[PDB]
Design a protein around this ligand. Structure first.
Ligand code: HEM
Ligand code: HEM
Ligand SMILES: Cc1cc(N)nc(C[C@H]2CNC[C@H]2OCCNCC(F)(F)[C@H]2CCCCN2)c1
Ligand SMILES: Cc1cc(N)nc(C[C@H]2CNC[C@H]2OCCNCC(F)(F)[C@H]2CCCCN2)c1
Ligand SMILES: C[C@H](O)[C@H](O)[C@H]1CNc2nc(N)[nH]c(=O)c2N1
Ligand SMILES: C[C@H](O)[C@H](O)[C@H]1CNc2nc(N)[nH]c(=O)c2N1
Ligand SMILES: [Zn+2]
Lengths: 407, 411
């Protein structure tokens, strides 16, 4: 019931009680651990509302006050009559910050309380959504000095009037299947790109075409919009020592901005809630560039470095990997676009865990996602035991809309 | 029930039925995942079911389930339990059991090899001197002048828990660590406590950076005794780098034989508390963990100094750069001296083939992702992208408390 986590590098032992407040289920049982699996009414709504308002009023040191009781009464009345309820602005901001705070897969949570929340609940159309999104993008980008932001569109009603951003991230590159058999651009985006073409987009058919937004308002058919190119900050990738690196013609975008998740606050569901921060270098240099099923560039780079690609044991992959990641960080730093390296981010996350343990009694964390995809054990998170559990408010996965939407 | 795992790189989906045969508990619940937690005297009543389950597995494996030989063996074991409160494994069953504990070891990436394991039966051993002799022979056999062979040596099983056989070393071959009055450590900081115990027991410590520790051996619940493995039996590799000629001048070496000696082997409810086993290294175990962990030899700074990397900010990735070079040096050095070693690319690629084969032939392969994914370059190995299911099958290798914490000293 009281649980210990140990750091094996420093011998620091922390005690977790926060897990006892966990509500949702992990996927694991006493017989089987699913830690490495990627995706493991009026009646229902009032307990959820109560649980949330209780933590909210506790958070502002007003638990059991008349203002607390009054709101609980007000929301109860609203559900009983309308079958749903509306969050106060203060509750919305609190819930959004807390969904990030509770995101057990996020290494960047030291920043959780510094989050700009844009209330787009008054939005009614896809053009409205586009306006809101451009404003988010411009605000967050801030000419390279990135600021965390979330934009919150109207909540689920009867589930037939959902707001959705069809894109997986606000900014991503198109992927195209070639007569050749291979793939031009980002292979992850092939299907979404086809949907864009199918709905009318004119693809420029290049390696790095910023996708258009496909926005769905009020459960209507989604529409296409090109983000003003001048709001999409991109970084050409060069190496501080290798002059040939630029010849690879690599670039990435500055703003990471997840648009396909569902924000759950007090039982209310916000199916369109794009949010953004700033990159950790490895996300681009390790995953986007080096995953076999992504831009998969390790072979080309290794060749340009004239490494012995005969045997895996020359560690040519590992050598090229480091250089690619040096280039990513260098290019972002040189163009003054906020980025964090994996040493710095993991060091911050350990300090954040320690703060959360002393001030909240714990910190849910998914070791499988928190440990960076390169150089695991030379980062402090590798040696840190973590307990993974699901607290609410939360960000959740949801089915891709095209599998669900009726035209 | 069926459970599916997906590889996110290849889209290969596998289906696990084997998890239905799992009995032991994980540490996890529906409400909490303990997947990153390092560590999450039996009655007759509890013993016969464990024996029965094991012997049913064994007899099925040899295609003799329900045969007369099967039934007679159950009757014979049952009778032995009721009469003596325990039982003895046949040689065939011990071999099968030891191979299966390895097959079932979900934290082991090296399991493609599980069916080639030399089993040394040391259940006739009675004294610490006897244990020393067994262990010397295992080391010599396993080492095989650099052409490493997997082996396990199995000492007598637990009886009342008061007569345990224990190897006190965590690994058969390890370097001493000494804490200096100024707070610095000479040698391996992981082995300081154990080194102090050895010194107290009368070991004459040379006090260098790579002193092979003496064996500390407990037979029959008696006080343990010290023995020096003959140096000619301890194969070592000096570490050098193929391009960096200054690398040799760091003065690094490592031993060739990784041999875990502190785990408990459970077969059919019997407990083998001394069962040292050995294989061969994956390069990262030395180049990443032993050399570069902050709490181990911690060589990253000195290596990056000598490479003249920009060390003023972490974002130059100097640590990542030095890490790859050290690991190249380890593979180069072992290969040049013809001592078996496997790189983390080859090892993980082989593990995925093993895992797929295990799914086809056995209905599953329990695997602990946290441990299987190498401690450098994780996502450029295929295991990073492989979903895995972790559960506990018997026979098994288990952790056990360190014997200095529990031993009743006789004097
Ligand atoms: C400020 C800088 C931030 C950094 C450096 C950062 C870091 C990261 C990283 C490295 C990941 C793993 C992503 C992957 O491997 O695909 C991640 C995941 C995640 N982060 Fe952050 N984050 C930041 C801001 C945010 C913000 C502002 C939010 C929400 C308000 C957020 C919520 C999440 C969630 C829900 C995940 C899991 C995504 C998924 O499961 O696919 N993070 N974070
Ligand atoms: C033949 C070559 C082998 C290779 C390359 C190999 C590889 C590894 C590696 C890299 C680890 C993780 C070690 C760590 O990070 O501490 C490991 C763990 C383990 N292996 Fe192997 N292994 C081999 C043979 C064996 C053998 C012969 C056995 C027993 C018969 C075995 C059983 C285990 C067990 C029980 C663990 C978990 C140890 C723990 O929890 O501390 N392996 N293996
Ligand atoms: C807000 C924020 C800041 C930051 N630095 N980084 C992020 C993660 C973003 C960027 N870089 C990766 C992307 O994360 C996107 C979410 N990943 C999930 C997935 F893509 F793996 C899918 C694949 C198919 C089905 C299962 N899950 C967010
Ligand atoms: C048989 C075999 C072959 C191989 N390549 N590699 C091995 C693991 C050995 C070697 N290289 C590391 C060591 O593994 C020993 C087990 N390590 C775990 C530990 F020591 F950190 C403690 C911490 C506390 C909790 C319990 N375990 C075995
Ligand atoms: C199967 C496994 O869970 C999968 O490859 C995970 C591993 N760790 C990860 N970690 C992060 N941060 N992001 C990811 O997409 C993944 N993928
Ligand atoms: C806390 C965490 O589980 C611990 O550091 C683990 C992580 N993965 C590991 N993986 C291997 N192979 N060996 C280890 O010692 C560890 N340590
Ligand atoms: Zn689990």
């Amino acid at each position: 019931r009281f649980l210990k986590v140990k750091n094996w590098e420093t011998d620091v032992v922390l005690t977790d009680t926060l897990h006892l407040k966990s509500t949702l289920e992990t996927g694991c049982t006493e017989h089987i651990c699913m830690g490495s699996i990627m995706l493991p009414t009026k009646d229902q709504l009032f307990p959820l509302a109560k649980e949330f308002l209780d933590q909210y009023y506790s958070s502002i040191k007003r638990f059991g006050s008349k203002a607390h009781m009054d709101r609980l009464e007000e929301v109860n009345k609203e559900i009983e009559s309308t079958s749903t309820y509306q969050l106060k602005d203060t509750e919305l901001i609190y819930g959004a910050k807390h969904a990030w705070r509770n995101a057990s897969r996020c290494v960047g949570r030291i920043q959780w309380s510094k989050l700009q929340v844009f209330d787009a609940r008054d939005c009614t159309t896809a053009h409205g959504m586009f306006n809101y999104i451009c404003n988010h993008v411009k605000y967050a980008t801030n000419k390279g000095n990135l600021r965390s932001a979330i934009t919150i569109f109207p909540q689920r009603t009867d589930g037939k009037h959902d707001f959705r951003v069809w894109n997986s991230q606000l900014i991503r590159y198109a992927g195209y299947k070639q007569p050749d058999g291979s793939t031009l651009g980002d292979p992850a985006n092939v299907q979404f790109t086809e949907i864009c073409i199918q709905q009318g987009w004119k693809a420029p058919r290049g390696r790095f075409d910023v996708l258009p937004l496909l926005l769905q308002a009020n459960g209507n058919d989604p529409e296409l919009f090109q983000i003003p190119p001048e709001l999409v900050l991109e970084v050409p990738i060069r190496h501080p020592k290798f002059d040939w690196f630029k010849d690879l013609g690599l670039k990435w975008y500055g703003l990471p901005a997840v648009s396909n998740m569902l924000l759950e606050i007090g039982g209310l569901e916000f199916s369109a809630c794009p949010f953004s921060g700033w990159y950790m270098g490895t996300e681009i240099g390790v995953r986007d560039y080096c995953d076999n099923s992504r831009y998969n560039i390790l072979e080309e780079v290794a060749k340009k470095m004239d490494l012995d690609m005969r045997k895996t044991s020359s560690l040519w992959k590992d050598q090229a990997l480091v250089e690619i990641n040096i280039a990513v960080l260098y290019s972002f730093q040189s163009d003054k676009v906020t980025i964090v390296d994996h040493h710095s981010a993991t060091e911050s996350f350990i300090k954040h865990m320690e703060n959360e343990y002393r001030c909240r009694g714990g910190c849910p964390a998914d070791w499988v996602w928190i440990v960076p995809p390169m150089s695991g054990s030379i980062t402090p998170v590798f040696h840190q035991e973590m307990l993974n559990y699901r607290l609410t408010p939360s960000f959740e996965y949801q089915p891709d809309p095209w599998n669900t939407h009726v035209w």
